[PDB]
Symmetry: D2
Subunit: 319 residues, 4 copies
């Protein structure tokens, strides 16, 4: 029996006895993602090059997500990688939910046509006060839903909630997200490690030792393969589907890591944990970090539970 | 003025005073690339999952091979076809026989298909040189003999990169109209880049020259900035980023693979031809990739390619290790 | 604020305090219409002609609507123009609603590439009896929702409910129906008449007289223009947009006309009346006919109220 | 073997030993038609209605105009949208003159009726500097003509010396696929097509002929009536199903309504190449010598037997 993102989301809303507000948020997000996919894939580019005789993808993607979420009547605070401060929804359009998102992840990769994506995390506003940027400062444990859209060789939306992780393929012929992977679980242990080894000179000693174990296995297993696409959504999605480990640890140009807690690390950590994986900063679970800045960065090590636990053991040995 | 791949190829054929046979070959290739691209982006996947009930099923690698084979045969422009999917070269039937020999990888990056990472198609076009009946040996030409080569990349967007004597030109596929649009003319690679690309998981089996060269990128002895690392895992994606951003891409020989992994005829040679036409380099370490005279249509070759300064720097380290 | 069919349908369900079953039905119907539209526009026809080295459009369209409605868990009885008997949904997937539909209207225009469409009408099951065809034998007055999809120069879905008639344009780039005309109302009087004048030799006398007045007005008024696409959806949609009158009347050889009450006349009559128009069989309003057979025919005269009332005046003259 | 419009046009050019100029013209026109089809079908309409926070007539004209100019194959372009002929700048001039309606039937586009692009291609006849008069050639001189129908599906019908060929646009890949080769119209049809709202204005020959279709004096079956209201849609049905299409003169349109250069002549050329007929009542449409680029003509076209039967009735009334 075929299922779609629209029907699946609506059915889960009916099960939870929701008022329909979260369902409208997800429907609006789904529409914005389809519009981003069309633009990322350069539909209409012929008009830019004069077939009949202007917006950067970063701005258009932000505008698409911002406008659809505002018009959903489901949100009150919107945090985006593109905006210095949180956007406060006007009272007439205001709902209960706080959405933190990266409208287009993979900035180094647009010009070379490597996979990009959108990352999102949805929180519930806990106060009766007027909404503010402070409402976005919540640990990932408070996430109601999270996931990402990957604009790779095909477009797929991965949605994680209490019920688990579910993957939907965009059928561009009919503009419909089709459920293709139900209740997905990551492999217990993988065979691929993913990180930028160009920072080897500045690596944490724990990072250096862990990578050495991947290349020279102490138990005489086969060495891991290496893959680093350079876009977090692509590297994380491969980790979900194939298993393994993804790392963006602290380096010296990024003593707290590079990736952003609220809208990059927390959503990916939430997807991993709902899929039976792990996601750590080295000191604690990513989802347990209590942020003080909506744009604060965090080191992230996520993936198959046996691979993350192995890195943690190396990290503990180095204190 | 706006320019399309169809218009561009036709005009180049007019300039060269061709009979139109190569123009028809390229037209058929472009149509096949559009069809592969549509399937890669999963058009009609809803029917596979039962939107209409239990009433295509072919895997993308099979369908891509079928598309390129059928379109090239129907172009009336080819006589010998070499594919990664077939052990022996396909000899085109006499009724549909043209002058050209095409070696192609219909869908490069197989390990990345299920994780939705960029994949692509690679092709190299040769002119038949002998007067014998067409056979496999007509595909055993060095890359120097290439008439045209390039690739289609099915990434965040779909781009056809076409390299010929006139240089390298990039076309963006506009899916709204099914038209490849010329977006970068006569592209030239950077003299030197800041990205290195290889599978470092094989470090234990690295050739000593590779070990030293990679060490130079992570720990530059001259106090310059260490290079960034990128390894998508699909040759088309990694090569295209090298073309666009500069840098170096390596799939070298190792202790277990004396001839590397990538195939000379339809992976290394077309990429080498694109790199050289763009002002880059492509070597096996011992010689230029384009100068290797193959004896087997599926023989492997080590490949190091990218910005000329970076490739030369590797060759310096390679010669130090002899 | 931009509005989509998905968001509009969901919000109307929230206002109605529905359980979400009708919303799921409409979502499923929306997906099927997009799938039909993609097939009608011949997506993938290159593979049928051997680009890589069978099912009629009516059958595929019927399969799409049948499967999407069944999997919605919202229907119990399905009456299609393409099926001899009413289809009874398997007990595990049964919902409260009865759907009568023509999956592809205008079959004679398929091969000449003239506009075609899909017509649907939605009823609530009125009894707790075991579902059967009698649950579809309801007067059009009992309709909960009705409308049509038009696959013309563009694809549009027209949805009629208690709130009125709303028109949504399908954006193929993203597979989204965009609300473009809200709460639409037909003109009081039009200037176009629509019927197959090739049947003039067998015309009912009222039809002969009425059409004669349209072409040779006794006033000093201009004669009406003539349009007859040959697909009911296209001719009716033009009547809604421009005003005027559409007729497929009875004659001596066809005392009940040709068009079918359940899935052609009732849905179009419902749209017309919600738009401020009329639709009559001559003897009574189309929506007041109580059917006894699921494929029973009915004469239909519909359009602007002044034009329909003028025809009924001529109809009364000939008894 | 699968065949595309691009391959078909190129192979025909190779057969004709052309220099490739007309092939570039047809390739450019094919690209514009795909762009019009995407726009007609409302791709990206969500952005017009504010998803992120040019009228079809003008945009269709710009697509055809720009693609034809950049083809380097044209010198004079006549469009229904432009009052005067467009003269290509000398640097981009080719030998061909193109007369087209970029979007026919758009006068009723608000009801989503089928629309289309109609085109006729001429070789420049005179050696004078290019001007409007270069488009005043009879339809007899057409090198190529046809139309793109944006109906339930998009199809390009291309008529040349070799005959009439029909290509379906596969929107999944943006490729025109040859689906009907060397098509011929039925000798006699069963459908008549015209706006009977002008019945009060019809000349006695038209009135008698239509009466014969509804009341056949020989007890045969009456013809069916179809009138989409868009010339491309009605003519294509006539080509594919057989029958007759009529837009005769009336009080509002004493010289007819449809345009000779870019509506009647291309459709007349397609019909004759398909074994059909197209007449004004007095002469073949293709033999009329235009004096004004936007001049109108009455037209009766379709299956040869149906047009011949009309012409007997016309002769009966002188
Ligand atoms: C919208 C549907 C289902 C069909 C008909 C109704 C309309 C309104 C317009 C269709 C005209 C058309 C231009 C169809 C092409 C649709 C299409 C193939 C959309 C997706 O574009 P892709 O070429 O698939 O983009 P990607 O392959 O890069 O995802
Ligand atoms: N579509 C849905 N899928 C999963 N959970 C939902 C959905 N809708 C609502 N919920 C749950 O119900 C809560 C309240 O719903 P709402 O009234 O829509 O805010 C949410 O915070 C979720 O915990
Ligand atoms: N479209 C084209 N672009 C570039 N070079 C071409 C083209 N067509 C033909 N040529 C050149 O002309 C030669 C003969 O053309 P052909 O007659 O098509 O075999 C080719 O091998 C190329 O060197
Ligand atoms: N999306 C909707 N739009 C309009 N009316 C609705 C909607 N959902 C429910 N209703 C109304 O509420 C009734 C019961 O809804 P349900 O519980 O979904 O069967 C329907 O029969 C309609 O009258
Ligand atoms: N693709 C083609 N299809 C049919 N006829 C063509 C084609 N190309 C050229 N011709 C014929 O050759 C003539 C001269 O071609 P050209 O040199 O392209 O102007 C044209 O006017 C046509 O009669
Ligand atoms: O070049 P680096 O340092 O390895 O950065 C890679 C990471 O940076 C990012 O590009 C940051 O996201 P943005 O591109 O949206 O700024 C991640 O997607 C990616 O994982
Ligand atoms: O996993 P590895 O050893 O790094 O191999 C990666 C290379 O193998 C390939 O996948 C070989 O191409 P195919 O997938 O067509 O066999 C290249 O695309 C890629 O550069
Ligand atoms: O050719 P006729 O007798 O005028 O019939 C036209 C009518 O028949 C129909 O085609 C019946 O619908 P179907 O094509 O689905 O059978 C209507 O769409 C149309 O209004
Ligand atoms: O409304 P009428 O008088 O029947 O005219 C119909 C004719 O007018 C036209 O719409 C004129 O063409 P345009 O719509 O492009 O101006 C023809 O397509 C059609 O055959
Ligand atoms: Mg970003
Ligand atoms: Mg990011
Ligand atoms: Mg390969
Ligand atoms: Mg391969
Ligand atoms: Mg039907
Ligand atoms: Mg019908
Ligand atoms: Mg017009
Ligand atoms: Mg016109």
């Amino acid at each position: 029996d075929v299922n779609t993102l629209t029907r699946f989301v609506m059915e889960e809303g009916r099960k939870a006895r929701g008022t329909g507000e979260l369902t409208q948020l997800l429907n609006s997000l789904c529409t914005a993602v389809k519009a981003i996919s069309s633009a990322v894939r350069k539909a209409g580019i012929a008009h830019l090059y004069g077939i009949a005789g202007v917006k950067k993808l970063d701005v258009l993607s932000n505008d698409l997500v911002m406008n659809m979420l505002k018009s959903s009547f489901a949100t009150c605070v919107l945090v985006s990688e593109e905006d210095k401060h949180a956007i406060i929804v006007e009272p007439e359009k205001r709902g209960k939910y706080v959405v933190c998102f990266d409208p287009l992840d993979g900035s180094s990769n647009i010009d070379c046509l490597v996979s990009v994506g959108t990352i999102f995390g949805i929180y519930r506003k806990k106060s009766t006060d007027e909404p503010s940027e402070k409402d976005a400062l919540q640990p990932g444990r408070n996430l109601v839903a999270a996931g990402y859209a990957l604009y790779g060789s095909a477009t797929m939306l991965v949605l994680a909630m209490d019920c688990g992780v579910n993957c939907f393929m965009l059928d561009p012929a009919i503009g419909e997200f089709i459920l293709v992977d139900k209740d997905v679980k990551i492999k217990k242990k993988g065979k691929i490690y993913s990180l930028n080894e160009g920072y080897a000179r500045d690596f944490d000693p724990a990072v250096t030792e862990y990578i050495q174990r991947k290349k020279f296995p102490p138990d005489n297993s086969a060495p891991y393969g290496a893959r680093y696409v350079g876009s977090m959504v692509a590297d994380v999605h491969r980790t979900l589907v194939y298993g393994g480990i993804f790392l963006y640890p602290a380096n010296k140009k990024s003593p707290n890591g590079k990736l952003r807690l609220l809208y990059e690390c927390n959503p990916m950590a939430y997807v991993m944990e709902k899929a039976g994986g792990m996601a750590t900063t080295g000191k604690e679970a990513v989802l347990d970090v209590i942020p003080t800045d909506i744009h604060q960065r965090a080191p992230v090590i996520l993936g198959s539970p046996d691979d993350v636990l192995e890195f943690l053991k190396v990290y503990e040995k180095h204190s």
